[PDB]
Structures are given as structure tokens and as C-alpha cells.
Ligand binder design. Structure first.
Ligand SMILES: *[C@@H]1O[C@H](CO)[C@@H](O)[C@H](O)[C@H]1NC(C)=O
Ligand SMILES: *[C@@H]1O[C@H](CO)[C@@H](O)[C@H](O)[C@H]1NC(C)=O
Ligand SMILES: *[C@@H]1O[C@H](CO)[C@@H](O)[C@H](O)[C@H]1NC(C)=O
Ligand SMILES: *[C@@H]1O[C@H](CO)[C@@H](O)[C@H](O)[C@H]1NC(C)=O
Ligand SMILES: *[C@@H]1O[C@H](CO)[C@@H](O)[C@H](O)[C@H]1NC(C)=O
Ligand SMILES: *[C@@H]1O[C@H](CO)[C@@H](O)[C@H](O)[C@H]1NC(C)=O
Ligand SMILES: *[C@@H]1O[C@H](CO)[C@@H](O)[C@H](O)[C@H]1NC(C)=O
Ligand SMILES: *[C@@H]1O[C@H](CO)[C@@H](O)[C@H](O)[C@H]1NC(C)=O
Lengths: 133, 209, 316, 35
């Protein structure tokens, strides 16, 4: 099958449409239906509203819904010994490394700043209560 | 919903995996020669004399220093993304958990009632409780009711008809009530409003006095 | 990019470890994010809604924001304006979007149809029909103005609305730089690629920037010395490119997150946040698609012709 | 990885402390709403 993304071989093209499973590109997706098929993705079901200039729809019942939302807050805090990583226990390397200036200090500083931020991120989210109820 | 879907918490697992990969890459780079005769520093020192060993060592220093610098740069970029996420989580805590939000789709789908926090590995989970309308019905409506030459509007609702009788109801839940002077207000005559219909407006004090 | 078709260079490049893998991974992550950014903004409607065959909305004319069926693009008059106004041989490839321009236009149409026929109800649950004039009445209440003000001035308000919409095309069409915000993004990306290609012409201390000439003239033990100079320079150039793309991608993500928020709060509801959905008191908004972006039309209420009165806190 | 000069630092707040904060937020909401 020839598509805008390239040449697709081994997939069975169909004239149906479904929700996108594995995206290929240019509106084309593939899924396992068994064999692998290729199709144009659907954007959803069609729904026509019965609009008029004197008609209104009003709920007579309701439901209670509970959904979940997940957010990252922090990373693992790390630290690197620049000299040890590069030179190990060699004093020959250590002395050579001095000719490059303060690169190791700069690297340690950058990682330290990140590590501190991770604790701030946690406090900002969870420590919003003044007392323990 | 969570227990039956092993990948439900992928958002947190992705963060863990990315950090682990970065460290593994940094370690594996130690095996590279970078043009040196050997990636093993001790072997170079044991075999070669100073004026020659230093040439081989500088090649390893350049490569390893470059690898470490690359690592740190990537961590700074990744950290910025995490900070943004934490800032959003902190906002949701304040607005969804410590209050009731009117922001659409901020605290889940539907009309927000309340939310509950739960802890998680390097993250937070919010349970959003919302109100969703159900089982709607068709009614005939009108912008105003004409009575005694005056135009009446709903105070807190909408005028509807069941095909034979007119009622006034709250908008988000069907609960039809008789149209009276206590649930409408009057403004102007009936000659201005487009789509105004004729109906009686009941005055509770009429039968009393 | 670095070695071309040289196996001599390719073998030398192996001594640098996994740098090429890391670079490919970084760019792949960016490419995926770009499709996520689009979905978060446009795919906020559960079903594809359509307007009535007869466009009777009480005097309110939406013909310039609704799709024009006479064209194969099925875009609005305004969208047509927006779209009109805004290396492979070196190992550089351009990948297609998952969603096509037609698919994005279809999402936009569904959002417009939903808003016009059912107000904000379709954003919370089932789409519940309501007469447009009555929808507008509720939006007036939301800004502290009684509903009778709308009904007694329906003709004036519909006319003010229709004129305000008509002026949009003139404001945009008469100002070639109006859409600079989107053009700037396109230009920045093009410049980055052109720079990456031009760097291939640099010698970096080598006798020649042309790898084939080095291999044809020099013997192995000498050619390798010249080649390593080109590898170092080209690898450094490619690493610089990727780093800049990661930083730029972060900025775009932030913009997409804001656009997604505005869609939810300005289009699928009525906002009380000051200057979030335009200047004045927010009534409603309409989305329009654009090249690598979105355009929002914000409809607001503005007070006019004030008069002086004497006041008091209470009556005795 | 420690042997290569790579170290992992502990969080200031423990998992127990985070759980305690969460419990306080839940108890507050249930008994006193948003007040
Ligand atoms: C899909 O439709 C085309 C005609 O547009 C036809 O030639 C093709 O064989 C059909 N394929 C399948 C799987 O039905
Ligand atoms: C409302 O829906 C519930 C189920 O969610 C049902 O048990 C109840 O009887 C319904 N009420 C009416 C009046 O239909
Ligand atoms: C309202 O009436 C229309 C026909 O005019 C019908 O298509 C629609 O399903 C009805 N809606 C409800 C909730 O019964
Ligand atoms: C409308 O409501 C009134 C009062 O409940 C009732 O008497 C009348 O029969 C209803 N009309 C229809 C068509 O159901
Ligand atoms: C509603 O539309 C009908 C035609 O379908 C028209 O006769 C009637 O006057 C309209 N009502 C209003 C208030 O515009
Ligand atoms: C409404 O009532 C007024 C006053 O009796 C009358 O003049 C008018 O024609 C009535 N409207 C309709 C549609 O019957
Ligand atoms: C809506 O506006 C367009 C452009 O001015 C006009 O051609 C069209 O006839 C108008 N529609 C109605 C119902 O007036
Ligand atoms: C109100 O009166 C002041 C003078 O006391 C005048 O300067 C101002 O323009 C008047 N405002 C309006 C709206 O007439």
C-alpha cells in the first residue's frame, strides 16, 4: 500500500474507519484485527442537534462521575564526582584535567541546583495545609 | 480501572525510565576509546611512558568530559519540564481540592463538585468528582410571557411547555412550577419582544385579597 | 550527515560511542510531541456536530466562520485568508503530521456547530439544543446584565455582531504582517536547517571540506588525520542543532498548553478571568484553524456612553 | 554506579510524611469543606 508516509508492506488496507491505534502519518493508522490492517482514522461519531427557534432540551436525571488525573512532581536527585568519573584514581589524569579550568565546578553546581529544586517541587504541592487534621 | 490496566500509570513510569536511561548511557560511554589505544586508563599508564601516555589520556579526558557535559545539559532541560508539571499540580491542589472551580475541564469533565488527592511515586493522583446531566427531554420554550399587556421574564429559570401548559423551571434540572409574580419580573409591554407568547401569570395575593 | 557514503569515516565514527543514537532519540521525541500538541488543542469534542440546513439564528450571521461547501477544502472564508497569508541528500528528512489540514478543519467545524446550537452544554455532557437568542440572554446574565436588555435590543446587537465579524477579514487582509507570530516560527525552523547544511562547507582545519577529495588524494594514515577533523566539526554542528531544537520545542509546548486551556475556557464555556478571553466582558469565542497554529475570535461586551449621577449607600 | 562517581541522594520528605500531608487534606475537606 502506498501512503504519504512511504510504502507500507504487510498491512491489509481496508475502507473502514476506526480510532487510531498505531499512527503512521497523514491520517493513516494501523491495528491488529487476526492480521494487521491499515485504515484512515475516524475523528468521532456524527451527531446532529435538533436546533429550532423555539425548542429546548432539559435534563430530568443526573449521574455522579469520578475520574483520575495523574501528574509528575519530582525526579530522582543525583550527584556526580566529576574528577572521579573522568580520571578515576589517576593522579596523572587529575593533573591534566586542571588545564581545562572550572568545568567540573560548573557541572557540580548545575546538578546541585536541580537536586534542591526537587524538594521545593514536592513542598509546593503537598504542604498546603497549615495543621494536621 | 487502575488495577486492570498495567499501563494506566505510564505517565509516572516514563519519568523513572528516562532518568535510568540517562545514567546508563553516561556509564556506558566510559567504554569508548575516543581515539585512544584503550578505554582503560590503567592499561595506558602501565604500558606507555609519560610523554606518550599523556597524549592517549587527553583523548579520553576530552571524550569523557564531553559526555558528562552532555548529560548535565539534558538534565537541566528535563528538570524544567518537571517543574512545570509540579506548578500545575500545585495549582490544582489549591483550586480543585481546597475549593470549587468554575474553570471548564480544569478539574475533570462535567461540572466540578470536589476533588481528593492521593500520593504516588514521584507524583500525585487527583480524583475528580463531577456532576453530569442525564435523560434530557424536548420542551417548547419562549423568551417571555405576555399578560395584562406586560412582558414577564423568568427570575432564575426558563419558560417551558409540555404541549398544553406553561411552566417555569431551573435550567440544569427539570422541575416545573406554576408561573407567578414571585418567580418572574416585568419589563415593558408586549410589543417589543420577538417570540413572546400569551399566558396567565398567577398572583398569590389575589385570592387572599 | 557526517560521513556521507564513506566507510572510512563510518568506521572512525564508531570510536565516539553512542552519540548518534542519542541525537536520533532526542529528535524522535520532539517529533512525537508535535502531534500530541495538536490533539490537545483541537480534539476536545467527543462527537462531530453539524449545523442546520437553514441558518436562522435570530439575525446572527456566522457565514464567515462556518465552512464554505462550494470549495473542496471545506474551509471558512476567514480560514482561507489565514492559510493564504502564512536537503534530503544531506540526510535531512521532513515527516508528515498525523492529522491532515482537512481533519483539523473538521474538528474546528464540530466545535463551532456545537457552540451555536447547544451553547456550553456539549462541553460538560450531552448537547442540549437552545435558541441562539436565548443562549445570548444567558451570557448577558453572566456579565451582570439583565436578560431583558438583550431581548429589547436584539436587532441592534445582531447588527453590531455582524459588522464586528465582517471587519475581521479587513483587519487581517490589509495587514500582511498580522500573522507574524506564526510566520516567525516557520522562519526560525528554516534557518536552523539552512545553518546545519551550510556548516558542511567548513574545513574545521582540514585541507578540504570535501571528504571524497581527501580520500582520493591522501593515503590512509594521513587521510584519517584530516577526516577526524571533519568528523569533530560536523558532529559538534549536529549536536548544537539538536540542543537548540529541544529548547525551541519547550517554548512551543508551552504555547500549545495555553491554546488548549483557552479552547476549554473561552470556547467551551464563559470565562470570568480578566483579559483571558479578550478585552471587555467575555460573552463567547470561536476557533479558526491556521498553519501550525490556532486563531481565536473573542466576542466581548463593552460599556458605552456613561452619565453622571448622584449616589448614596442607603435610604432612610 | 557509585563506583563510577555517581550517587543518589534521598528526598527531604519521606513517603510517610507525604502520606500524612495527604491525610490532613482529606480530613480537612470532609469535615470542614473549603473553609
Ligand atoms: C476500497 O475501495 C476501493 C475503491 O475506492 C476498492 O478498489 C478497494 O478494493 C477497496 N478495498 C477494500 C479492502 O474493500
Ligand atoms: C435516575 O437515574 C437512576 C439511575 O442512575 C435511577 O435509579 C432513577 O430511578 C432515575 N430517576 C428517574 C426519575 O428516572
Ligand atoms: C427532540 O425532537 C427531535 C425531532 O424534532 C428528535 O430528533 C430528538 O431526538 C428529540 N430529543 C429528545 C431528547 O427527545
Ligand atoms: C401538562 O401538565 C399538566 C399539569 O401537570 C397536565 O394536566 C397536562 O395533562 C400535561 N399535558 C400533557 C400533554 O401531558
Ligand atoms: C420561528 O420560526 C418560525 C418559522 O419556522 C417563524 O414563523 C416564527 O415567527 C419564528 N419565531 C421567532 C421568535 O422568530
Ligand atoms: C395575545 O393577547 C393579545 C391581547 O388579548 C391579543 O391582541 C393577541 O392577538 C394575542 N396573541 C395571539 C397569538 O393570540
Ligand atoms: C450572511 O452574510 C453574508 C455576507 O454578507 C450574506 O451574503 C448572507 O446573505 C447573509 N445571510 C443572511 C441570512 O442574511
Ligand atoms: C461628570 O462631571 C465631571 C465634573 O464634575 C466632568 O468632568 C465629567 O466629564 C462628567 N462625566 C460625564 C460622563 O459626564
Amino acid at each position: 500500500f502506498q501512503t504519504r508516509a512511504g510504502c507500507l508492506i504487510g498491512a491489509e488496507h481496508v475502507n473502514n474507519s476506526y480510532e487510531c491505534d498505531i499512527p503512521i502519518g497523514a491520517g493513516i493508522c494501523a491495528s491488529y484485527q487476526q492480521s494487521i490492517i491499515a485504515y484512515t482514522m475516524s475523528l468521532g461519531a456524527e451527531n446532529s442537534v435538533a436546533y429550532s427557534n423555539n425548542s429546548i432540551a432539559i435534563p430530568t436525571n443526573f449521574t455522579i462521575s469520578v475520574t483520575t488525573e495523574i501528574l509528575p512532581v519530582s525526579m530522582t536527585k543525583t550527584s556526580v564526582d566529576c574528577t572521579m568519573y573522568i580520571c578515576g584514581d589517576s593522579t596523572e589524569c587529575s593533573n591534566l584535567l586542571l588545564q581545562y579550568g572550572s568545568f567540573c565546578t560548573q557541572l557540580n553546581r548545575a546538578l546541585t541546583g536541580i537536586a534542591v529544586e526537587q524538594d521545593k517541587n514536592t513542598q509546593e504541592v503537598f504542604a498546603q495545609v497549615k495543621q494536621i487534621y | 480501572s487502575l488495577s486492570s490496566t498495567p499501563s494506566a500509570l505510564g505517565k509516572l513510569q516514563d519519568v523513572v525510565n528516562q532518568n535510568a536511561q540517562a545514567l546508563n548511557t553516561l556509564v556506558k560511554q566510559l567504554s569508548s576509546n575516543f581515539g585512544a589505544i584503550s578505554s582503560v586508563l590503567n592499561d595506558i599508564l602501565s604500558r606507555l611512558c609519560p610523554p606518550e601516555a599523556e597524549v592517549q589520556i587527553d583523548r579520553l579526558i576530552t571524550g569523557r568530559l564531553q559526555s558528562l557535559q552532555t548529560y548535565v545539559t539534558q538534565q537541566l532541560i528535563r528538570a524544567a519540564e518537571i517543574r512545570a508539571s509540579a506548578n500545575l499540580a500545585a495549582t490544582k491542589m489549591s483550586e480543585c481540592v481546597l475549593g470549587q472551580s468554575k474553570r471548564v475541564d480544569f478539574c475533570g469533565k462535567g461540572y466540578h463538585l470536589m476533588s481528593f488527592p492521593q500520593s504516588a511515586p514521584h507524583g500525585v493522583v487527583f480524583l475528580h468528582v463531577t456532576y453530569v446531566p442525564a435523560q434530557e427531554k424536548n420542551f417548547t420554550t419562549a423568551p417571555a410571557i405576555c399578560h395584562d399587556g406586560k412582558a414577564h421574564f423568568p427570575r432564575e429559570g426558563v419558560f417551558v411547555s409540555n404541549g398544553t401548559h406553561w411552566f417555569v423551571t431551573q435550567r440544569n434540572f427539570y422541575e416545573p412550577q406554576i408561573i407567578t409574580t414571585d418567580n418572574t419580573f416585568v419589563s415593558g409591554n408586549c410589543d417589543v419582544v420577538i417570540g413572546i407568547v400569551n399566558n396567565t401569570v398567577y398572583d398569590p395575593l389575589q385570592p387572599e385579597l | 550527515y557526517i560521513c556521507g557514503d564513506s566507510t572510512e569515516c563510518s568506521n572512525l565514527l564508531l570510536q565516539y560511542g553512542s552519540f548518534c543514537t542519542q541525537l536520533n532519540r532526542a529528535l524522535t521525541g520532539i517529533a512525537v510531541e508535535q502531534d500530541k500538541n495538536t490533539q490537545e488543542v483541537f480534539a476536545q469534542v467527543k462527537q462531530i456536530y453539524k449545523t442546520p440546513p437553514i441558518k436562522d439564528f435570530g439575525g446572527f450571521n456566522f457565514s464567515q466562520i462556518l465552512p464554505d461547501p462550494s470549495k473542496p477544502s471545506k474551509r471558512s472564508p476567514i480560514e482561507d485568508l489565514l492559510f493564504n497569508k502564512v536537503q534530503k541528500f544531506n540526510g535531512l528528512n521532513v515527516l508528515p503530521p498525523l492529522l491532515t489540514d482537512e481533519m483539523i478543519a473538521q474538528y474546528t467545524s464540530a466545535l463551532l456547530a456545537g457552540t451555536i446550537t447547544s451553547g456550553w452544554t456539549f462541553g460538560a455532557g450531552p448537547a442540549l439544543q437552545i435558541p441562539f437568542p436565548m443562549q445570548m440572554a444567558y451570557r448577558f446574565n453572566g456579565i451582570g446584565v439583565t436578560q431583558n436588555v438583550l431581548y429589547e435590543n436584539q436587532k441592534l446587537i445582531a447588527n453590531q455582531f455582524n459588522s464586528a465579524i465582517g471587519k475581521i477579514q479587513d483587519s487581517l487582509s490589509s495587514t500582511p504582517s498580522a500573522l507574524g507570530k506564526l510566520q516567525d516560527v516557520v522562519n526560525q525552523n528554516a534557518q536552523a536547517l539552512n545553518t546545519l547544511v551550510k556548516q558542511l562547507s567548513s574545513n574545521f582545519g582540514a585541507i578540504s571540506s570535501v571528504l571524497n577529495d581527501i580520500l582520493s588524494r591522501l593515503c590512509p594514515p594521513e587521510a584519517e588525520v584530516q577526516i577526524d577533523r571533519l568528523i569533530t566539526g560536523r558532529l559538534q554542528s549536529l549536536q548544537t542543532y539538536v540542543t537548540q531544537q529541544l529548547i525551541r520545542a519547550a517554548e512551543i509546548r508551552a504555547s500549545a498548553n495555553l491554546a488548549a486551556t483557552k479552547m476549554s475556557e473561552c470556547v467551551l464555556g464563559q470565562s470570568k478571568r480578566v483579559d483571558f478571553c479578550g478585552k471587555g466582558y467575555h460573552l463567547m469565542s470561536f476557533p479558526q484553524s491556521a498553519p501550525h497554529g490556532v486563531v481565536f475570535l473573542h466576542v466581548t461586551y463593552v460599556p458605552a456612553q456613561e452619565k453622571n449621577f448622584t449616589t448614596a449607600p442607603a435610604i432612610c
